[PDB]
Amino acid sequence: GPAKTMEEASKRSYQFWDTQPVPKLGEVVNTHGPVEPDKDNIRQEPYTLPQGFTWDALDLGDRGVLKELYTLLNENYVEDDDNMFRFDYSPEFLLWALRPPGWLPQWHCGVRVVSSRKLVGFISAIPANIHIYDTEKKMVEINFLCVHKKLRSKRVAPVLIREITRRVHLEGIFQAVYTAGVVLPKPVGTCRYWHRSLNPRKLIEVKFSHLSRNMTMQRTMKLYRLPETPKTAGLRPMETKDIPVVHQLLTRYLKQFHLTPVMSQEEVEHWFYPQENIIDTFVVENANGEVTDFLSFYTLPSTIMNHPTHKSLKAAYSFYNVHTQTPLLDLMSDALVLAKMKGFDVFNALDLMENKTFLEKLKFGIGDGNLQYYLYNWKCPSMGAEKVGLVLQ
Amino acid sequence: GCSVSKKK
Numbered sequence: 447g448p449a450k451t452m453e454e455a456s457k458r459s460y461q462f463w464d465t466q467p468v469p470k471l472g473e474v475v476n477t478h479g480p481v482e483p484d485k486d487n488i489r490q491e492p493y494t495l496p497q498g499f500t501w502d503a504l505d506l507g508d509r510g511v512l513k514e515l516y517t518l519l520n521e522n523y524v525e526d527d528d529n530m531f532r533f534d535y536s537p538e539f540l541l542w543a544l545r546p547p548g549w550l551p552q553w554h555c556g557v558r559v560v561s562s563r564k565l566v567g568f569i570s571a572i573p574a575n576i577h578i579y580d581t582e583k584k585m586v587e588i589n590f591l592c593v594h595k596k597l598r599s600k601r602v603a604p605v606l607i608r609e610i611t612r613r614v615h616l617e618g619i620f621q622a623v624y625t626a627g628v629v630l631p632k633p634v635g636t637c638r639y640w641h642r643s644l645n646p647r648k649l650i651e652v653k654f655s656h657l658s659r660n661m662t663m664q665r666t667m668k669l670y671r672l673p674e675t676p677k678t679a680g681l682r683p684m685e686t687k688d689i690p691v692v693h694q695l696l697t698r699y700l701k702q703f704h705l706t707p708v709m710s711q712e713e714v715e716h717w718f719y720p721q722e723n724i725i726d727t728f729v730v731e732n733a734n735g736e737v738t739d740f741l742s743f744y745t746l747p748s749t750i751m752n753h754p755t756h757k758s759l760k761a762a763y764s765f766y767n768v769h770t771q772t773p774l775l776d777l778m779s780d781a782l783v784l785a786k787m788k789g790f791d792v793f794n795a796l797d798l799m800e801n802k803t804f805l806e807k808l809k810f811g812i813g814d815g816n817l818q819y820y821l822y823n824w825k826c827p828s829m830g831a832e833k834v835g836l837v838l839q
Numbered sequence: 840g841c842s843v844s845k846k847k
């Protein structure tokens with residue numbers, strides 16, 4: 447089984463991860479570099495799946511195939527620790543997350559049942575330039591590892607991981623970054639989700655939160671009430687003319703952290719240009735016409751499992767927030783107001799980058815879910831959450 | 840993959 451805490455994880459043997467070029471959970475890392483040298487001959491044949499299952503690369507430009515992936519994740523992807531909420535990535539969100547600049551069709555790696563053609567497994571890779579301490583490396587980001595509930599505990603996830611590794615190796619890339627809600631060998635950083643209630647009545651009704659014993663519903667609703675409009679002068683949605691300055695602002699802002707993406711201007715357009723119900727970015731254009739700050743958050747609802755009335759929890763997730771003239775506290779306050787205006791029930795943020803400076807002050811409450819950060823085939827010292835400067839969807 | 844958190 448999986449381990450959510452470092453306690454549980456110390457008691458595990460990792461039959462798969464012991465075979466992989468990652469550090470052991472027990473060791474402390476005092477060096478910087480690849481775990482193993484680059485391979486100059488790569489396995490040409492796909493790894494063998496169990497009988498009755500076949501590989502199939504997913505063309506997400508086919509609407510029907512995209513909907514099959516939507517359905518696999520909607521029914522079988524990540525749940526909270528109490529099996530009450532499950533991610534509900536939309537088809538259009540999946541296209542955003544899975545076709546950034548440089549995406550490859552072979553890195554959308556599906557498993558189908560041979561007879562029925564049912565999609566029962568998936569894993570993905572997208573290319574990314576990653577800055578880790580003093581090194582910049584072309585890597586991939588791994589995401590959406592999913593095995594159908596009926597196919598579980600049959601060692602299909604290790605096969606998915608080895609096959610995407612092989613397909614990435616064929617393109618000359620030997621490092622990866624990824625996250626997980628569980629502890630694996632070996633986290634480079636550990637983050638914690640925090641939650642800012644926007645519609646506390648619904649959150650309590652669906653048991654996403656609870657009334658804290660000595661507070662009433664009326665007190666809780668007043669506690670989380672927000673202004674109707676944002677307060678920062680010149681706040682407006684990002685437009686095409688802002689792409690260069692958003693790129694510049696982000697590039698300079700990220701230098702202070704130890705694990706960050708290095709985005710081209712085209713990647714900046716992809717990741718930040720607003721798309722309704724996927725990604726929102728607002729810039730601050732001052733009295734001189736200069737863009738000095740920006741905030742962004744992505745749209746990711748959760749299915750509320752087995753509930754008769756409320757079926758979906760509308761969640762906004764803090765993405766990248768860059769401040770040079772507006773205080774970060776004011777920026778995030780305006781993000782909360784905008785998310786409330788757009789109908790979200792909760793605003794989520796990790797404790798990475800400078801987020802701890804605003805979490806308690808803006809009335810976020812700590813969550814029960816960790817987000818561990820990992821590198822594959824890269825040895826380096828771990829870092830505190832405040833030095834993680836990378837957000838994956 | 841990401842992880843699903845709720846309020847402690």
Ligand SMILES: CC(C)(COP(=O)(O)OP(=O)(O)OC[C@H]1O[C@@H](n2cnc3c(N)ncnc32)[C@H](O)[C@@H]1OP(=O)(O)O)[C@@H](O)C(=O)NCCC(=O)NCCS
Nearest residue numbers: 460461462463523524591592593598599600601603626840
């Ligand atoms: C996570 C999931 C893909 C694992 O599939 P599974 O049916 O349990 O496959 P198995 O447990 O038989 O394979 C065991 C190996 O896979 C590893 N593994 C389990 N979950 C993993 C994860 N999220 N990421 C990477 N490796 C994982 C296990 O640690 C184990 O390796 P180990 O022996 O070194 O400990 C599956 O449970 C699933 O789809 N869960 C919902 C979606 C999800 O959580 N996706 C990944 C988020 S990081």
Ligand SMILES: *C(=O)CCCCCCCCCCCCC
Nearest residue numbers: 589590591614620621622624840
């Ligand atoms: C969330 O879905 C992440 C699941 C990560 C599974 C482990 C990925 C290990 C890296 C594989 C690619 C290596 C390429 C050099």
